[PDB]
Structure 1
């Protein structure tokens, strides 16, 4: 009597993830005339008006 056996197994797993985000903003103002307190109030870069 002769008995023989063979077994084999393999597992492969690869994972990849990429994330890229970009955002910019720019502002240019050019005001001529009446450089008093009110135009400094209007010189507020965040609010548009």
Structure 2
């Protein structure tokens, strides 16, 4: 009697994920006219109102 069994197995799997996001915001003011404390308080760089 002759009997011989052959079995071969192989597995492969790769998963990849990448995400990138950016957001930039700027605000510039320009005031000319006023010397009293009113323009000094208005010269606050920190809300455009």
Structures share fold, TM-score greater than 0.5: yes
**TM-score between the two structures when normalised by the length of structure 2:** 0.75
How has the CA–CA distance of structure 1 residues 7 and 35 changed in structure 2, closer, same or farther, with 3 Å as cutoff?
Answer: farther
Of Structure 1 and Structure 2, which has the larger fraction of its residues in strand? 2
Misfit runs of 4+, over 2 Å: 35-46
Range with bigger deviation, 19-28 or 33-42: 33-42
How has the CA–CA distance of structure 1 residues 27 and 5 changed in structure 2, closer, same or farther, with 3 Å as cutoff?
Answer: same
How has the CA–CA distance of structure 1 residues 7 and 46 changed in structure 2, closer, same or farther, with 3 Å as cutoff?
Answer: farther
Distance of 1:7 and 1:25 partners within structure 2: 62
How has the CA–CA distance of structure 1 residues 26 and 3 changed in structure 2, closer, same or farther, with 3 Å as cutoff?
Answer: same
What do you get for the CA RMSD once the two structures are aligned? 1.6
